[PDB]
Amino acid sequence: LSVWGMYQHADIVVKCVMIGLILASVVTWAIFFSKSVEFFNQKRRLKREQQLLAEARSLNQANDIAADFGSKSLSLHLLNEAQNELELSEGSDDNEGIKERTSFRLERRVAAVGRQMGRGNGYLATIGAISPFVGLFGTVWGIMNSFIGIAQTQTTNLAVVAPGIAEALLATAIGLVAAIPAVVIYNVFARQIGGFKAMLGDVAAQVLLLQSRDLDLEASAAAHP
Amino acid sequence: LSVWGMYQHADIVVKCVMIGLILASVVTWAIFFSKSVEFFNQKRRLKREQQLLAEARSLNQANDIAADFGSKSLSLHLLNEAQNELELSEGSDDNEGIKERTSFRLERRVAAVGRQMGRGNGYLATIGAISPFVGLFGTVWGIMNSFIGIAQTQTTNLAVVAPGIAEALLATAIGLVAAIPAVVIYNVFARQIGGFKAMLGDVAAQVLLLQSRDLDLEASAAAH
Amino acid sequence: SVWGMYQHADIVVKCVMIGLILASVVTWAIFFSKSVEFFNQKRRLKREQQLLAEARSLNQANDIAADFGSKSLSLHLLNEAQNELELSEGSDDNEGIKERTSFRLERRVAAVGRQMGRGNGYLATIGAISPFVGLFGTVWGIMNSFIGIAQTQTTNLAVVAPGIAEALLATAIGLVAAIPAVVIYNVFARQIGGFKAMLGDVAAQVLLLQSRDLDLEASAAAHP
Amino acid sequence: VWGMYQHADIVVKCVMIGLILASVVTWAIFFSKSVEFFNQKRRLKREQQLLAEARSLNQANDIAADFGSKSLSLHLLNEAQNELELSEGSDDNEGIKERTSFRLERRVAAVGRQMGRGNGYLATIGAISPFVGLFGTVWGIMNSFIGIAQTQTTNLAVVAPGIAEALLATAIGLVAAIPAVVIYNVFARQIGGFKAMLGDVAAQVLLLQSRDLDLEASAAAHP
Amino acid sequence: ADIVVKCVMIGLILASVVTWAIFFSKSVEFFNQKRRLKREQQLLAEARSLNQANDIAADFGSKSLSLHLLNEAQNELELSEGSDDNEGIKERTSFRLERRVAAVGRQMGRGNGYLATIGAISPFVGLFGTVWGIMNSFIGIAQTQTTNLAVVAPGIAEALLATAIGLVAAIPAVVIYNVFARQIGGFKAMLGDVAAQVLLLQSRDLDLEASAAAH
């Protein structure tokens, strides 16, 4: 029979389940497209900007190069955090304490920068994990209704009640359809986690080494001023 | 069957399985209600007190902002812990040590309050994991009595097996109903644990650095 | 017929199965390339670690770990070391440098892991989920088989005897992409993990060497 | 029957014997590591009673001298004397220790990598052996479906030897699965016990040489 | 009736007996530990000197875990004699706690992975029982053309009994492990609170040494 003749015939609970699977898939596609486009904007842009800033070599030329990145420079906002600590370094004669106070502040924001895009992830990943189990309940619901329907009188002949079991298995089908690429998309987002967090941690350690060598100058090269 | 029919269509042991799954479901729905509305209160308080405490340019200013939170602010008791170690390290010229000493104190206390609210994890997670296996027991019981019904008939058709099939599928479906929202709202609440407790740690590092910068002032700027 | 056994069920199931087999082949290429590459690395760092545990000075380390071929990772570690030695110029603070330089190499060691960390999702996760892909293809095939049973009702014995076996065969090709691929990153952990030790040993050692070389300042060149 | 051993297929029998021969290889792994950490727990028990109160690094050496040449404590004393010979001229006692310690601790991971091998066999094979058996099932039931599409009665003993060899594949997957992850959990308790106690010994040596370098940094200071 | 499937089922039931015995012993011990720790935690919360730490922990009896940690602390008080290094000790002594307390947790570390993985793989050994049973059933009907599955229906039922007792052993072992690891977290947290309090006590006392010699 036709797919509408198989589908509107099917149980409306299973229908609502499968349409919920497809709508959560649409949410997942939207989130995937957004993270993909934004992350490669980050990757290409801040990769060339990383080539710029890895030999900025002054920590004020790091400011000057990151000044013209456009407004979306996360790194210039971390440089603003560094200048904030310099404003918190006012009166702090101990260079060595500052640095410790500096250190985690970067990895206070940066993984938060990671948790800038940390939202939505557990959602769609666990959707991709547990959606076939949702479709499995759809199968149990449909096959349960069919095998109550052939047990009340009680009849036989699975072959005349089998389309109800097929419409039940359609739930597991759409659960698997939603299940595979959502786990795939969180795995490639974990590769994004690796690339972005590692690379921007390289940038963080770059700024740490820039301002760390500058405080080493102020503590040891300016020890003989 | 009928309404009272499908009440009686499942056997009384299968009925006990049904009621056990649905009662565990409903009591952890109440656990869900508690966690949801309490974390709701906590995150709206998080939003307002985060806006109130980001401006805390002094830790004494932060104490002032901790005052007009109500007495039941977690951050108020964290500043109480801060003043506690100000009075316990009262006399510690080792400004370099104290804060580290304080930090891991901090890295328990309201985190333990967060580890308060992780008490209900086993309910959602593990009961949603084992509920299909309870459904597996329901299948074993129903298909064993279905085999008894075949041995009473030796007809080997759908009629001689099918009421036990329906009872086993009823147990399976109620196992899945007790399974899926438990584990998925478990993962929801653990993600809430992550986000909320992380931002609480952000506030904790804010207070740590307020005291850290003020004791750097008292160490090096009040040296001078 | 054998080509009849190819052509029983459907061609979408064929497409899914050959997609499994082609992903298998490109990950075979991944396995083969990383295997021969890490043997080159293992034999190399084997004799290099033999010669560089006896590199009793960092200048002897620059002598020995130069070549070894021009493409040693340890050469780049020596390059980063001399980089921050040239960036240690002006600051007499021995105590800072090395600490930072430690994690420089360790972040470079992260880079070393990030040398080969990219592409493992293919191997491991495809080996995990390929029977789930074949499970879905089997769901597809059995639902079409139930359409065929609905075409010839009142008798479901040999309406679909072979064709379901093709859909299960889809699971089989999921099964034929299941076992070794997970195992591959298991392979591509273990002595690679020792590599995470081994190379992560020696530059650390060189760090230690440089640490003791800074003692050759801080305990020896301290008083002129 | 002997024909019922090679019944209707031999490549599924080939994966039966592949599962149980990999089992025998990992049994050799099991009993080897079993008698290994048996010797280690007896030895390190005795050596623990010895070097728990080795009052000096000289007592850490001499009370380790009766161990035989095959003690790991001997290697750790080699590491300690190595850093002593490498810190010759190092008036900085205060550094050395940190620089020494994680040497030990990398060696400690090498201690784990004393038997880092064999483990993935037991653990991962004991996980996925019924999936090998599952492919055996799919193979057997596809061949039985060839048979019952050749007969087209599709009932009832015409599927039975294919069902039997599919369940035989399942059963050999299960026999390979359960004791292998069992033995890796046993070996993870070996990891815990040996790692922890040898780390106690490592911390003991670090405390000993830490207090001795403190006595050198405060040798003519506290009097 | 059958014996090998019965051997699997009694292996399940005897592993359940070992599991329940461990659960009973652990749970009674944990109540003793936790209500005693509730009272003694209220006691030692204001143990404000190391001497007050010993004196408040004195009436605990010898069954106090923390009294042996006071012994640990006094041990490296006595072993650090001779050198003026206050400054190293503490971290080391912290790590002594990072040994000893873990050992305390590893004091109960033995049967945990046992019954956890038992509750994990109990349906898998029940699965092996039903595989054994249904395979013997199809050996029983391995003739040319059979019908009437009632000749193999109670054999598959007795095979499913293995899955049944597999589930019966599967549930509370994983359940009780999750409960036990949860209060492993809780009890180790309170014990780490105690350890941190002792470290802060001795840390403030060494700071009063280094500051009372300074002031």
Partner: peptide, 22 residues
Amino acid sequence: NVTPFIDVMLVLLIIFMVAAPL
């Protein structure tokens, strides 16, 4: 984690059930 595919055996039991009325 990868446990519930005893449900595949449950599908095999459904196949066992459709073999029955024949």
